[PDB]
């Protein structure tokens, strides 16, 4: 509700 | 509800 | 409801 | 489910 | 569930 | 569940 | 979503 | 979401 | 979310 | 019962 | 019962 | 019962 | 399941 | 389950 | 479960 | 929900 | 929810 | 919730 | 209910 | 209910 | 309920 | 519901 | 519910 | 609920 997700997994290999 | 998802998985190999 | 999805998986190999 | 979601309700008497 | 989520309610008498 | 979440309620008499 | 309400009831008596 | 309400009830008596 | 309310009830008597 | 009701599932292999 | 109700699941393998 | 109700699960292997 | 009802109402008038 | 009812109401009038 | 009811109400009038 | 599941009702009026 | 599940009701009026 | 689960009710009026 | 089991497995080796 | 089990497994080795 | 178990496992070795 | 009610189960290895 | 009610279980290894 | 009610269990190794 009225929320936001920028990212969950940023995986740099 | 009135929410936003920018990204979930950003995987750079 | 009144929501938006920009992206889910951005996979650069 | 059986809710009121993302709505506007105006009443005048 | 059986809630009022993200709504506006205005009443005038 | 059976709550009032993220809402605005205005009443005038 | 990205909308506007100018007014709902304009009443002159 | 990114919206505006100018007014709902404009009443003149 | 990133919204504005100018007013809800403007009443002149 | 044993469902997926209004949910989001993302699986990356 | 044994469901996924309004949830988010992200699985990266 | 034995559900996932409005939750977020992130699993990275 | 594997049960028996002899009688429910015996009404002598 | 594996139960028995002899009678519920015996009413002599 | 494996139980018995002989009677509930015996009413002599 | 609001049901009668495997029950017994006896009503003498 | 608001049910009768495996119960017995006897009502003599 | 607000149920009768495996109970016995006898009411003589 | 009013039944009988003589045997299930008679194994001779 | 009013039953009998003579035997289940008779094993001779 | 009013039952009998003669035996379950008769094992001869 | 999802039960084993008034049943017999025999397993031999 | 999710129970083992009035049942017999025999296992032999 | 999730119980073992009025049952017999026999295990032999």
Residue numbers in the entry:
A (entry chain E), B (entry chain M), C (entry chain U), D (entry chain X), E (entry chain P), F (entry chain H), ...: 350 to 362
What text comes from the article?
Functional tau is most abundant in neuronal axons where it binds to microtubules, assists microtubule assembly, and is essential for the structural integrity of neurons and for axonal transport. Here, we identify a new amyloidogenic segment, PAM4 (Polymorphic AMyloid segment in repeat 4), encompassing residues 350–362 of R4, and show that it self-assembles into amyloid fibrils. Cryo-EM revealed that PAM4 fibrils are highly polymorphic, and, remarkably, that the polymorphs formed by this segment in isolation recapitulate the conformations that PAM4 adopts in polymorphs from different human tauopathies. In all cases, the folds share a C-terminal β-strand (residues 358–362) but differ in the way they orientate the N-terminus about an intermediary GS-bend (residues 355–356).
We also determined the structure of PAM4 amyloid fibrils formed by a lower purity (92%) peptide batch. Two-dimensional (2D) classification revealed that this peptide batch also formed multiple fibril polymorphs, with three distinct PAM4 fibril structures that could be determined to high resolution. The remaining two PAM4 fibril structures were determined at resolutions of 2.7 Å (Type 3, 15% of the total population) and 2.9 Å (Type 4, 13% of the total population), respectively. The Type 3 and Type 4 fibrils share similar structural properties including crossovers around 80 nm and containing eight PAM4 subunits per layer of the fibril core, differing only in a slight re-positioning of the inter-protofilament interface. The resolution of the maps, in combination with liquid chromatography-mass spectrometry (LCMS) data, facilitated the identification of an adduct coming from a minor population of the peptide containing an N-terminal Fmoc protection group from peptide synthesis (~7.4%). Similarly, stacked protected N-termini pack at the protofibril interfaces of each of the three fibril structures with the C-termini extending towards the anterior fibril surface, which could potentially explain the additional structural morphologies resolved in the presence of the Fmoc protection group. Interestingly, the folds were interchangeable within the different fibril types, with Type 1 contaning FoldA and B, Type 2 fibrils containing FoldB, C and D, and Type 3 and Type 4 fibrils containing FoldC and D. Additionally, FoldC contains an intra-subunit salt bridge between K353 and D358 that stabilises its highly kinked (>90°) conformation. Specifically, the FoldC conformation of PAM4 stabilised by the K353-D358 salt-bridge is also found in tau C-fold protofilament polymorphs linked to Alzheimer’s disease (AD), Gerstmann-Sträussler-Scheinker (GSS), primary age-related tauopathy (PART) and cerebral amyloid angiopathy (CAA), while showing reasonable fit to chronic traumatic encephalopathy (CTE) polymorphs. Finally, FoldD PAM4 matches R2:R3:R4 (4R) tau strains that are associated with corticobasal degeneration (CBD) and argyrophilic grain disease (AGD).
